[PDB]
Amino acid sequence: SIRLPAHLRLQPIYWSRDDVAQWLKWAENEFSLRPIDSNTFEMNGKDLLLLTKEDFRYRSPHSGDELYELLQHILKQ
C-alpha cells in the first residue's frame, strides 16, 4: 500500500496548495526520493493536474519523473 496521508485521499481536483506541498513530502519520504524543493510546486491540485511529465522534470530534475508516475498511479485508481 502507498500509505497516502488521510487528507490526500480526496480526489486531487480538490487538493489545496497546502495539500500539494504535503503530497510532495509524502512522495519523497514514502519512496525515498531525492530532496524536492517545495518552492517549485506552489500550486493547487487543479494546477498540478495540468502539468506534463516534462513540467515535473524541469521543476525536479532528480525526482520529477517519479512524481509524475506517482500521480499517474493515484489517477489510475
Author numbering: 15 to 91
From the publication, what sentences describe this entry?
ETV6 is a modular transcriptional repressor of the ETS (E26 transformation specific) family for which head-to-tail polymerization of its PNT (or SAM) domain facilitates cooperative binding to tandem DNA sites by its ETS domain. However, its propensity to form long insoluble polymers via the tight head-to-tail association (KD ∼ nM) of two relatively flat interfaces hinders identification of suitable small molecule inhibitors. These interfaces, termed the ML- and EH-surfaces (mid-loop and end-helix, respectively), lie roughly on opposite sides on the globular PNT domain. Each is composed of a hydrophobic patch encompassed by polar and charged side chains.
The introduction of an ionizable residue into either hydrophobic patch yields a monomeric PNT domain as judged by several techniques including equilibrium ultracentrifugation and native gel electrophoresis. Examples include the V112E or V112R mutations that disrupt the EH-surface or the A93D mutation that disrupts the ML-surface. To examine this possibility, a variant with both A93D and V112 E mutations was generated and found to crystallize in 2.8 M sodium acetate at pH 7.0. Its structure was solved to 1.86 Å resolution using molecular replacement. The A93D-V112E-PNT domain crystallized in the space group P6522 with two monomers in the asymmetric unit. Most importantly, the presence of both monomerizing mutations prevented any intermonomer interactions within the crystal lattice via the ML- and EH-surfaces. Rather, nearest neighbor contacts were via alternative interfaces that are not relevant to polymerization of the wild-type PNT domain. Regardless of differing crystallization conditions and mutations, the structure of the A93D-V112E-PNT domain closely resembles those previously determined for other ETV6 PNT domain variants. Most importantly, the local structural features of the ML- (including residue 93) and EH- (including residue 112) surfaces do not differ despite the presence or absence of monomerizing mutations or their association upon heterodimer or polymer formation.
